[PDB]
């Protein structure tokens, strides 16, 4: 992107295998889900009276990103940031939507996930198939908790909460694997151990920009997040600050 001018829509990542769209539209009474490779079948949820989760996997299909973006009223410079997967997590507020860029860890792998909250949709953009959001899927499907009774702002909370819980499970799992490898002096074990330590180092770097995002979502929130949902965002934020540093 060094040569390219502002506004150039180019995917900068390494995943060009998968493409699918997955929709879950729900209310108190019912839910509906489907998978498709036909972008025209997701456009009508823009105007839905009930909350929709649209998940687009394979942003290498920049034609599909542009189609969805232009129909949903997403500014071209936001579409540029969705496709540019080499950037620091951040949150940006516009009049009709909230834009969030996060990292998702899932043989440790990173991908960028973008989320757009409108009054009735969460649009989620991913690089490759596989995510940490199955527990939210399961709550929609079997009507567990309160997600089916709430709006898209609570859907955003639920997705970010799943990501944050997974993050803290993951780095506990990495600490345990590292402790075991150290009880184990073969060349493969040593180089592997040093690999897992470098991985743990990159995991813990991402807490700082994530805390900036979580802070903005509960302190002077914009109108697309309702007063009643703010306490849920405050709980996700609070969960990141529990083992505080000490000066002594």
């Amino acid at each position, epitope marked *: 992107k060094k040569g390219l001018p*502002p*506004g150039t*829509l180019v995917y900068t990542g390494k995943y060009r295998e998968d493409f699918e769209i997955e929709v879950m539209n729900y209310s108190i009474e019912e839910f509906r889900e489907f998978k498709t490779t036909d972008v025209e079948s997701v456009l009508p949820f823009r105007d839905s009276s009930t909350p929709t989760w649209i998940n687009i996997t394979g942003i290498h299909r*920049t034609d599909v990103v542009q189609r969805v973006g232009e129909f949903f*009223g997403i500014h071209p*410079l936001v579409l540029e940031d969705i496709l540019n997967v080499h950037q620091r997590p951040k*949150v940006e507020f516009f009049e*009709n939507y909230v834009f969030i860029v996060l990292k998702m860890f899932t043989e440790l792998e990173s991908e960028q996930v973008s989320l757009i909250l409108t009054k009735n949709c969460v649009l989620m953009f991913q690089e490759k198939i596989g995510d940490v959001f199955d527990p939210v899927r399961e709550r929609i499907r079997y009507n567990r908790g309160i997600i089916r009774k709430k709006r898209a702002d609570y859907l955003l909370y639920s997705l970010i909460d799943a990501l944050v819980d997974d993050y803290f499970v993951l780095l506990e799992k990495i600490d345990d694997e590292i402790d075991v490898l150290e009880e184990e002096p073969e060349k493969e074990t040593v180089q592997r151990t040093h690999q897992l330590k470098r991985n743990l180092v990159e995991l813990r770097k991402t807490i700082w920009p994530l805390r900036e995002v979580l802070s903005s979502l509960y302190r002077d929130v914009p109108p697309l997040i309702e007063k009643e949902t703010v306490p849920y965002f405050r709980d996700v934020y609070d969960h990141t600050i529990q083992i505080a540093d000490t000066v002594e």
Partner: antibody
Amino acid sequence: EVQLVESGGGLVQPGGSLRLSCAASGFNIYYSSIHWVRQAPGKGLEWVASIYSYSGYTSYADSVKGRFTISADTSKNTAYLQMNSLRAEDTAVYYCARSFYVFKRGTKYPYYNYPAMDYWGQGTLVTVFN
Amino acid sequence: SDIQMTQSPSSLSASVGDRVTITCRASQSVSSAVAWYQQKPGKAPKLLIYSASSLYSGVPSRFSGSRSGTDFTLTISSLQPEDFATYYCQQSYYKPITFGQGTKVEIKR
């Protein structure tokens, strides 16, 4: 410095085809979004098609979708509208136009304006006949 | 599912020196993504105003635009002879792009 000049308008029959061209000078079409807008005799402005030239991404009004193809030749610096399956309601002055937007990146509240059409050619007349 | 832009009036009559007001109403929120264009007989449209209220380079300051929710107004503070013309509003928030019907500013007699 910036100029769009449309050409290629004339008589065309249903069954036939017509290619309109928009020659751009003072800027490179490669990094631009180019539009066709038409006006039927005594009527208003109607958007037809747009091309984001860097990716070749194209957009069409439902009234032309599947009949007209927009394209850009980034070595001639020229956009085209290829008109097929002509109908009497396609009779109109066709205008080419460039869009722009103003912005500043950064902060939690980025200053992002949506595009408008700064530069227009003087239009080319397409007359559909039996 | 296209956004409709309802422009009024289709025509109005005015004299030189009049304040003229032209309205456009979006069927849904288009944020501020509204532009205004002038067109004279036999000529291409010319941009006057973008993002509801930004005056385009070289356009006289007697043209102003404003917004209230989904209501958009073009104002000519003091009409001059060269301002008898057709005006169009356009939203660029959603694709497809949609134009108002137009307002013809005619000579009062």
